[PDB]
Amino acid sequence: PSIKLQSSDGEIFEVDVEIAKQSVTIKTMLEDLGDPVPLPNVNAAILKKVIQWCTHHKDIPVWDQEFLKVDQGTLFELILAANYLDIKGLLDVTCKTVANMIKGKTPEEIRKTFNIKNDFTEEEEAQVRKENQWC
Amino acid sequence: ITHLPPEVMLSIFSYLNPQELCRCSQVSMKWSQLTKTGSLWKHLYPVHWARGDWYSGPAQMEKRLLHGLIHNVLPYVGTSVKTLVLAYSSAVSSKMVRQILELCPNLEHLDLTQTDISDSAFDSWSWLGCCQSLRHLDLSGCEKITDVALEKISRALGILGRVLLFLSLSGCYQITDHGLRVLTLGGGLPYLEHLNLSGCLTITGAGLQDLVSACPSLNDEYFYYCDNINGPHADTASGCQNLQCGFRACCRSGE
Amino acid sequence: FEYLIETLNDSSHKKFFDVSKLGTKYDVLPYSIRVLLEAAVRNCDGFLMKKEDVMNILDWKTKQSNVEVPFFPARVLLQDFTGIPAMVDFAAMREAVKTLGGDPEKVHPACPTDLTVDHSTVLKNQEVEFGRNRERLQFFKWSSRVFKNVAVIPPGTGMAHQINLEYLSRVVFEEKDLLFPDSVVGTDSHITMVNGLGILGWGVGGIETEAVMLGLPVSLTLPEVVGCELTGSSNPFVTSIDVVLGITKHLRQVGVAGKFVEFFGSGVSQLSIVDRTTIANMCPEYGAILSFFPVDNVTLKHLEHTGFSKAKLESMETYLKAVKLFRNDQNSSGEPEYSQVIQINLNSIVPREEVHRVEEEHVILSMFKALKDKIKRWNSLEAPDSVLFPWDLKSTYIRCPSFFDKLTKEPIALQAIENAHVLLYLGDSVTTDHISPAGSIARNSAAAKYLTNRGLTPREFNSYGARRGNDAVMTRGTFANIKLFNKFIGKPAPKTIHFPSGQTLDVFEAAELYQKEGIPLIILAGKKYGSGNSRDWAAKGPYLLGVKAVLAESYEKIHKDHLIGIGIAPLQFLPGENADSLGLSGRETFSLTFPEELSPGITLNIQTSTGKVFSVIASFEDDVEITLYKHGGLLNFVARKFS
């Protein structure tokens, strides 16, 4: 029929059971207790996108390629939501997208695109740069 | 990207070839330990990689790669290596192989076709089970291996272990009846479905009958051996594949 | 050039072509271009050997490597069994001439062939290899009995390659009171060894020998001669191998690549014939084509020992001196003008007569006469003696091919290909090892399905080269290399797509389904189609599959001629175009029409079923190839002359 998912911000979302059948954690949480189930680890701004992806696969694609074009603060939140719901398809397609964002890039600009802190010391940085080649 | 748990960064670090996997290794101190977990270095092709082909799939610049991933990678990964394809290598000695086979004990697929390999490249294989769970072993063209390499291969498979599914001694013209009577020890090979002895011209059908009587799963379409010999399955097996071939050894020219 | 035929002296009766009367530039040529000019002046029949090509080997000072000339050898060597595809073709031409109103006995090779079969447990394998090579040895025995030119050296002699080639040496030929110098091009691996004895001979592929036995000449660009002056007596303690490696090392560093290395000077008389043959047999080491040691007094003092009589050696002297092919070590009057001389003083060799004086009356004289009586299982082997070969119909080794079916003398007009279907769609650098079969027969191939219907076990499938007399096995291995990258399939699989039926099966099984429907075939390829050496069935295979033309961006020059001489029109895309510049996927129907009077290098329009016309260059070089194509091939053209 319809299952009720509650986000972190107090809002309740309704969706069909076959949609939540792909959510392995929900599929395992719907065969033991037998509608108002809360999800306090995913925000509604990410639920609106994860349910949008999940309803498309009710049965890399270009629809996924256009759907996965957002800010990193939202893409990585989507990945953290797919890890919590164990949606293997979404998790795998977002892993593919992120690993595509790393294809052919020097280790210097990786930190610039992903906003990483160079937490190296010169005695290790010279040891790490020396052993990763053979390259 | 830092809020992601390590189990998701490990999944992200799977669509990256080993060149990108080592570029990412010098971004942060967490990735430096996280790109050498072992689930990312299962299959390694040191000859395709030092050619522009970074495959890392299920199944010169070259000396630098074999010297790099022998002190920089294989000690750290290091026991989670599944395959190792050194086929048609320009710079691979019996020393650069004795040091890879000592760090990969869970190897599943060796491939040493047409390499300057002697029967001393298997000296690291002595504790009776060294590289068990080995499924594929391709030594086609290593004409320098005698029946002493097979005494270390028949020991480095274990006991019933002995899960070899492929054996391609195709050109190793120096193995004899003792080189095959030793493979039928402990087991012998009960899963072997392919036995390419096409080129070993100095074995005898009496010593090959003893080998075939210990490989019950042997497919006969994939049982090649010398044409000038009277081994088993004469009306169902195949003949030598090294006819009209300059690469591999052959007792006749087939011209 | 029938006016230089001067009679020799009063020795017995002989005549010869006195090339010395060609001008004041003949005494200037090297001694290896004089052999080319002599062989060119007596075969100048106007069709194959032009007259514009005799005044092209004579103008050698200015017409070096930038010009190509033909060469008419005096004989042909063929290795162990590389002569089967030629002798089977002649045995089939005998029948094709019989069933045409012709005498099946004029059919002989156009030059003396020598089938050196003993070339290319250790003893227990010999009996099995004989029992395996029994039908082919029987065919060689019949062919030696039947054809006047052909001669066979049976398997088992002394010992591999060295004095068998000196026993066949006939340095001055006799053919109907004519005299001319020897020349031996063939598929023997040690065939350059004859150069250290005054015999201009190099190595060619199997197709080129098979085409020289049919009257066509070997093509060749005017080489550069690097005449290596070799003066001074060697040091009192040097060996033969030391001097040999010294000369070889001095020639390797100067870099003689694809050029004649004729030797001359006053120290050449110190090199024995066993040393000249050694320096000649090592041409691939310093990268040369030949190392010609002209005929001098040492050569004849060697011939006197080995086989020949005095009444023959005096005539040889007189001929070689009257035509200026004799190099006097102490009477050098006419000195050549090599394009790049090299000085080698033999006083610069560090590690003689005591060993050279031995081989004069010692074993050499005995070894040659012992081999003369070396020529057990060969004169014990039943073989036919009839004019036509008694073909065995249950045979899988020797089969009469279908090149002459049907022959129909006075050839028909040029048939236009109509509604062909691309059999193969290939890439760039398609070597002849992908076209021609070789190696063991694959257990899952078309040839294995053929040989299994004949009742052969999988271990009785021989190699693909041990069944080169059987044309069915050979055309079932054409384009059946597991590394064949067919662009209809993608991945490198030895298969193709039958278009009217849609299925994916072997190349032979597709060409065969195309044959039953009467649909011609073509082939699309890329750059340097047919690269590499010339293997047999590299042009026979495609022709017997049903191919009528080949489309490629560029062929190898050696393979374009073998395609023309089998009846496969080799076509090139206009400069700039290719397959991926016209929208051709390879699934249309191409239609040609050779208009009339095929001039060399003519452009002809190929049409399609998708309404896409495009011009394509008919890569015909000269009128010899245009005529070989108008006659449906070289074998048909030759068989029409015997009828």
Ligand code: FES
């Ligand atoms: S290797 Fe012995 S038969 Fe080919």
